[PDB]
Every structure is written in C-alpha cells, then in structure tokens.
Amino acid sequence: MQEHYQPAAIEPAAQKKWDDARISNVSEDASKPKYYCLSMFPYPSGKLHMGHVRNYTIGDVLSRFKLLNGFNVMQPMGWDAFGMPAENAAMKNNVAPAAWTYDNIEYMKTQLKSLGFAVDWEREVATCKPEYYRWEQWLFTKLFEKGIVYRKNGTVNWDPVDQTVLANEQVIDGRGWRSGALIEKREIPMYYFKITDYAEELLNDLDKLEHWPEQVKTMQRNWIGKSRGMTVRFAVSDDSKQGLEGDYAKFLQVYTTRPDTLMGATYVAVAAEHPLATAAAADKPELQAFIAECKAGSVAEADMATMEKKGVPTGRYVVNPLNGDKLEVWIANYVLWGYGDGAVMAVPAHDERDFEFAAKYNLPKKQVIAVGDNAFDANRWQEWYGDKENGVLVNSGDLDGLDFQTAFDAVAAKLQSQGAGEPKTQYRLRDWGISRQRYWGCPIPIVHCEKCGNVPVPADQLPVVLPENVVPDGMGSPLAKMPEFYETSCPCCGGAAKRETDTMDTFIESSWYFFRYMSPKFSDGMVSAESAKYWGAVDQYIGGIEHAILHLLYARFFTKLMRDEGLVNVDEPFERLLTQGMVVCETYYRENDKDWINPADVELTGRPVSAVLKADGLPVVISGTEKMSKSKNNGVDPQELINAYGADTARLFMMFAAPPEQSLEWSDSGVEGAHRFLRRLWRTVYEYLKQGGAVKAFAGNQDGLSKELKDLRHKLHSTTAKVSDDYGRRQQFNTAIAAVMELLNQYDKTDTGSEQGRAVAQEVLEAAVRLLWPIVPHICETLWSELNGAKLWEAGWPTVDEAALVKSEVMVQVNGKLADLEAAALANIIVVPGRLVNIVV
Ligand SMILES: CC(C)C[C@H](N)C(=O)NS(=O)(=O)OC[C@H]1OC[C@@H](CCCn2cc(-c3ccccc3)nn2)[C@H](O)[C@@H]1O
Numbered sequence: 001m002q003e004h005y006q007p008a009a010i011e012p013a014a015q016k017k018w019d020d021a022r023i024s025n026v027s028e029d030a031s032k033p034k035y036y037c038l039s040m041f042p043y044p045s046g047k048l049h050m051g052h053v054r055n056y057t058i059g060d061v062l063s064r065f066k067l068l069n070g071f072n073v074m075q076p077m078g079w080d081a082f083g084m085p086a087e088n089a090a091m092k093n094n095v096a097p098a099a100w101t102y103d104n105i106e107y108m109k110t111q112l113k114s115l116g117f118a119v120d121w122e123r124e125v126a127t128c129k130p131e132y133y134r135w136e137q138w139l140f141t142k143l144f145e146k147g148i149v150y151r152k153n154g155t156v157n158w159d160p161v162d163q164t165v166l167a168n169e170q171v172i173d174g175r176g177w178r179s180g181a182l183i184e185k186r187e188i189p190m191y192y193f194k195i196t197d198y199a200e201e202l203l204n205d206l207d208k209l210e211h212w213p214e215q216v217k218t219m220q221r222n223w224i225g226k227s228r229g230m231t232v233r234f235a236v237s238d239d240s241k242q243g244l245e246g247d248y249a250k251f252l253q254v255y256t257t258r259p260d261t262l263m264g265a266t267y268v269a270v271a272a273e274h275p276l277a278t279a280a281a282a283d284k285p286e287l288q289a290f291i292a293e294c295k296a297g298s299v300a301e302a303d304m305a306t307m308e309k310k311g312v313p314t315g316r317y318v319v320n321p322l323n324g325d326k327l328e329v330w331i332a333n334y335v336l337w338g339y340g341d342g343a344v345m346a347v348p349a350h351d352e353r354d355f356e357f358a359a360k361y362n363l364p365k366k367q368v369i370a371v372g373d374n375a376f377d378a379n380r381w382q383e384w385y386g387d388k389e390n391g392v393l394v395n396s397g398d399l400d401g402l403d404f405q406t407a408f409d410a411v412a413a414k415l416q417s418q419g420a421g422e423p424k425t426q427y428r429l430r431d432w433g434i435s436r437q438r439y440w441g442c443p444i445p446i447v448h449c450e451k452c453g454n455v456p457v458p459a460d461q462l463p464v465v466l467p468e469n470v471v472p473d474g475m476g477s478p479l480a481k482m483p484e485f486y487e488t489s490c491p492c493c494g495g496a497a498k499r500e501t502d503t504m505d506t507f508i509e510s511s512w513y514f515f516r517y518m519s520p521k522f523s524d525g526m527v528s529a530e531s532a533k534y535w536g537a538v539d540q541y542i543g544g545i546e547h548a549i550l551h552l553l554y555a556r557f558f559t560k561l562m563r564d565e566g567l568v569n570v571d572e573p574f575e576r577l578l579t580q581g582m583v584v585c586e587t588y589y590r591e592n593d594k595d596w597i598n599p600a601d602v603e604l605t606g607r608p609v610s611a612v613l614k615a616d617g618l619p620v621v622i623s624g625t626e627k628m629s630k631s632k633n634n635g636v637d638p639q640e641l642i643n644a645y646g647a648d649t650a651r652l653f654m655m656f657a658a659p660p661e662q663s664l665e666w667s668d669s670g671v672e673g674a675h676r677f678l679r680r681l682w683r684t685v686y687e688y689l690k691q692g693g694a695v696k697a698f699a700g701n702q703d704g705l706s707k708e709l710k711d712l713r714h715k716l717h718s719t720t721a722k723v724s725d726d727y728g729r730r731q732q733f734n735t736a737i738a739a740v741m742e743l744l745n746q747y748d749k750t751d752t753g754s755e756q757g758r759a760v761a762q763e764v765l766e767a768a769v770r771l772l773w774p775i776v777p778h779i780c781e782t783l784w785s786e787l788n789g790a791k792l793w794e795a796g797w798p799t800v801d802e803a804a805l806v807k808s809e810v811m812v813q814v815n816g817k818l819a820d821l822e823a824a825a826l827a828n829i830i831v832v833p834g835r836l837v838n839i840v841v
C-alpha cells in the first residue's frame, strides 16, 4: 500500500476491476430481487455540468447501496438527443446536428465513465437513432387509428423574419425574442394527444404514489385542474338581443364552481371572441380595439395570473335565473375562449379576482356568504370571503342558512327544474400538441394523399428515417425544403403523396425511455414482454424539480397508454421520486466600454478581501450568487474538478455540501475539505496496516472487552444503523457522511493497540469503507482490498450488531434492612463495591 493517496492511480484501476467483473451489466435474473434506479438522462449538449454530476452521483449512491444489499440493480444511462440545441449549434458551426450530437455523446460518455458511475452501458440508448424512435412512430400510428392521436387546426405564433414558429415564452411584447418583429397568429393543422381522455385516471392515480413528494402531487393536481361545478344559463334581456343568432340570442351560458354564490353575482364577463362581444362591439370602436388587443395577446400559463385583468362594459344585459336581477355583460381579458363556454359570472364578494376587478371599476359587491360573526368589509378583502367549508348562505332568500354542499344541490335543483342549468365537471388540462416545425426531431409517420387523406405509415415501413445529412440554414424548417424526403407514394393507393414534414415534441422520447432500457435491442416491439414483466416499474427516480409537471405527467400518460396497448403491466412508471436542488455559484465580471468571467479563471485575495484574474492579475469585481448558467458565465466545469482532485473528491463534495433537495453552493474551500477527508481516510487505514497488518475483524460476544472498546463498537453499530437509515429512508447523504466522520473521530481517541484493540479497529475500518463505498467507491474499493481479501460487493452492506447497542443491579437498604451507586441510590452511607449500598441514617 502506497503511503499517499493518489486518485489518478487508483480510480482507473477500480473502474477496470468493476468493468471486468461486469457488476453493472445486469440481466433478467429472477434469482436476485430486482431494483431499478433511474436518473433523468441528459441532453448531449457537449460536456457534463455540475447539475449532471450531482444528479448521477445521487443516483449512483442509491444504486451502490442497493447493490451492497444484494439487489439486482439496473442503473441505465442514455441520451435525450433530439431538440433545438443541436439545430442552433448546427447553424452557428455549419455542422450536421447528428454529427454534432454523436460527438457530444462520445465525449460525455467518457466523462460519466471517469466518474465511476455503476452504469449498465450495454443498455445505452440514443433517442435520435432510428432503432429508438421507430417505436414511438409505431405507437403514434396505433393511437392515430384509435383516435387518441388526431389532426386538427391550431393557432401558433409565426415569426415572419426568422421564418419559424415561436412559443408564448419566446414572445416579448408581441415580438419575436431574437428577431424583434411582430409575430402573426396563424391557424395551421397540427397533431394532438387526447390526454384529456385520461385526465381522471391521471388525477386519481396520484393517490397511489405514497413515496412521491406532496408538492409534486399537488402541482400535478393543479395542472389537471379538475373542478366540480355548475353550468348556468342567463337569459339575454329583451333589449340586448340585437345581432345575436341561435342560442346566443336566447341565453348566455357560463360555468361556475361556486353556484352557492349565484345570488351574489353582480355582473358577467365574456371572452373577446364571444358572440355577445362581437354583436356589442359592432358599432363601438373602443370595444373593437379591446377585442383586438385581447386577440393579439400571447400570455404563458405561468404568467396568466400575474397579468393585469382589464375589461370593458358592453351595454348588453342578461338575467340571473335565481333572483331576476339584470346584470351587465363585460368583455374581459382573463376569460379564455376554449375554456368552458368562454363566459363566467363574477361574485366580487367571495372571489378575490372578482373583488379586485370590481374594485377597479367600482362594480357592486354583494355578500351572500358568512363565516362566523366575522364582519364583512366591502373595501378590504379578507381570506374568509372565499371560504367554502365553514361558511353559510345569507342574503340568498330561501337558500339562507345552508352550507356549501347543500346549497350546491339546492341551486342545482332550482336550475334543472326550470331548465336554467345543470351540474358539470370540467378540467383545466388541454390536449397535448406534439407537432413541431423543426428538423432535428422524430418524423411524424403520416403521408398526405389527396385521395386517401392523412394516412399512417404501415408498421412494415417504419421507421420513417430522418435524413442526417442536413445542415439547417435559417429560412424555415429544412424538411419542407427537401422534396427528396417528402415526395413519396401513398401506402394505401400507390399514388403521388407527401410525407408530413413536422417532427414530434421532444417530450415524447423521454415519456417512455425508461421502458426501452428494459430491452433496448428488442426489434419486435417497444419493450419485450419478458423484460417488462421482470423489471416492472422504476423503483427510484431522480431528477430536477423543473420536470415535476410536464415530463412526469407525460411519462405517466404514456405508461397508461402502453399498458392499455398490452405492452406493460404497471399503472405508474415511478415508485419513489427524489428531486434534486440547483447548483449555484458566485458571479464575476469586469466592465466594458459587462462581460462575465468564469470562476475557474479567477483567483481571490488572513481574511479574503477581493478577487483578481488568474491570467492577468489586475482586480475583478465580485457579484451575487445564483444558479450556474451561460448567462453570467458562473458555471464551474466539472472536468477541471476531476483533473485537479479526482472523481471521488467531486462525488464527496456534492453529497456532503447539501442535502439533495437543498440548493448546493459551490465552494473552493468545501472542495478542498472533501479532498482532505479522503487523504485522512487513506492515512487512517495506512497507519493501521503499517503497525501489524490486517487481522480478523472482531465478531460476536463482546463480554470481556474493555469499556473503551465496547464504547467504540457501540459507536460503530450506531453509525451503521444511522447511515443505513440515511441512505434507504431519509435519502440525506450529508448526515451519513458526518456520522462516519464521528466514528473516525472516536476511533482516533481510542487506544486500539492491544490484540482485542486491533480486532475492533479492523471491524471499524471494514465497516467505514463499506459505509462510504456508495459515495466514494474508488478509494473504498482500494482500501477494502488492503484490509480484506473478499470481494467488497460480496461482503455486503454492514450489519448492525444489536448486542453492541446494549449497555451494562444492586440492592439498597435503609438502616440495615431492605460515589457511582450512591448518586442513584439516594434517588430511590457506605457502599460495598458493586453489590450493596446502605443508607446510614
Ligand atoms: C427526462 C428528461 C426530460 C430530462 C432532460 N433530458 C434533461 O433535463 N436533461 S439535462 O441534461 O438538462 O439534465 C439531466 C438531469 O440531470 C441534471 C438536472 C439539472 C437541473 C438542475 N441544475 C442545473 C444546473 C446547472 C449546473 C451547471 C451549469 C448549468 C446548469 N444546476 N442544477 C436535470 O434536471 C436532469 O435531472
């Protein structure tokens, strides 16, 4: 054993030893119990970043822990390869997105390998390969024939200068983010998943996920946004029917989740596209401009509530079917055509949004609910205004005194009896639009024939291969400019036809890759039936919180789709869900005629004062801490951390600095501290072996050990129990590291020089290297080989010796008849050592 710890010598050797033993190349061995630990696979952007390293270290800690406990562990990795990064990198560098992608995959693969992740590389997948995406094209065609995938016209934001379609998040004040030109709303045909047909299943199945964070479940329930409410029809007043046709001349229908407050509606509001708005604005230019400004909007859903609510009165009136009151119709910008009936009632007394709207325009507020003896104030909003469970109706006529649910049913009865409304269930969830006007994505397996219509490609002809010999320019989607791709024969009639040129939303590939890992070379289906039956579902899933809504809902949706196709036997893809925090770092710049400088290119000025540039030496200015990004150039390249300290130090620093959910602050001092602990770990074993070498670890009956060695064995088996619970239950690895640190501290203060002392020392070290192996496997594998000849993974996870956790009875008489023992005896004077104590009073 070499005296000093050198990661560059031991890490490649350990990886070679793990690869040769093929410990991570697992099969459907029904002898060992299966465990499927999955981290979210990355985009092949070029290099690993520290977010990657944190995620895949967390995934590897859990995997190695379960491996040491005798599980058949699958930890697969792969590449989420389609998407815009490759297309933009293609435009900037004049390279094909495929070539750029495969280069990144090779570089990042070697980086992941140098980090020591116990990955089954034989199960590797790349979603941009035809052997992957042929199967989502296949599922597409099956769902398309069933109607779960349909084609319908939709509205998109078109940029006329950049010649591409933009998302709402990419539109700034009506203009494209890069071009700066006014976007144009255009109606074009697109494809959709009917995810709304699975809404009730997606919502209810969330209750099965007892090992999911409650906030993720809450966020998904709110996204689906189911509501049990009431359809209500307000008769149009006889003076307000000018210009309306059909049922819009008869009534204005709205949806409401608060029918118990119908007595308190003081106005109604319609969408800009509602026929009432059209007929009212017919002679009023102000309303026409308000309708136009509404249509021109491009508000993202994460900003719909932050949008200022504006409205204009129309001069039209409707009648409340419960109290006869005449109510004015307003055009409002928060009423969305396509949600419900595109019309809502407003109760400013018991809905906060209605309260602010009515306060802006001085519209009436009528209290109809009371909660306790609370005073109602028509000028200040109070939280109890919106109370449903605790309130009781007032000012509501014969409905006074009822709670929410009995008022709901009573209003439903009155409405249904006179035909004015009925109960209705609604969902905020929209159907999933998957068409993309991009090149670097999975082609849509539809052929357009003017005789046969939209024809799905036959299963024999799949895949539709995306041609990789393409360098996107910058004047529209390249596939629509390639007749060599889109000119084809109809597979129903043989006539001239045109392939679909739009590609699929890249969320589709990540909605099922966890099943493809089960059988990634299966040529006869998405996943082989024997593999899906053995691996079942993912036991542990790790990834960032930014994917808690869309990706997770998509993955759950796809699982139920594949289940209903007969491909899988699970309702839910992920059993346990751990979400990792962000990585943040200080920022630095130097002013321009700012240009942010990377932290690794900077040294800082015993107390730290200021910072300077490394190459030069003249000062730089230090800014605030925030998430690592290209925006402020504060991303710390993990490769430089590997090169400076080794992979074990990188893995230790990220697991010790913060719990997985908390944000991790980059610290040069912290990284050095982790490296010093590994040096200490190395020195502890080395010094131990140099005074005697290895012995048989202490085992069994510890009666006869000294108190100091009994206390060290108590610390050992308490640390083993603590660490085991931090890995398996709390998933809090920083405290597990601290606990091993405390075990080593007590070991250091214990004289382990005797024969029984060496045996307890051997036991302590053999446990501490196995306890740390999931976090720092390279140095622990090396240290274990010097301590013990058995294979580390076959020695197994350390067991807790309950006998070491037990601590080590005298009589006490008063006046004859029934230091250490005197203190407790007086809590019930000469003391015979160990047997009797006598109270001499
Ligand atoms: C399942 C699919 C949809 C996953 C998708 N391919 C993806 O997100 N691919 S990805 O390649 O972007 O990330 C793969 C995977 O590991 C990293 C996690 C990082 C997020 C938090 N973060 C980022 C940073 C950071 C640090 C330095 C520089 C820049 C940024 N610091 N902290 C992801 O959430 C995900 O779990």
Ligand SMILES: [Mg+2]
Residues within 6 Å of the ligand: 210
């Ligand atoms: Mg259960």
Ligand SMILES: [Zn+2]
Residues within 6 Å of the ligand: 449, 450, 451, 452, 453, 490, 491, 492, 493, 494, 495, 497
């Ligand atoms: Zn045809």
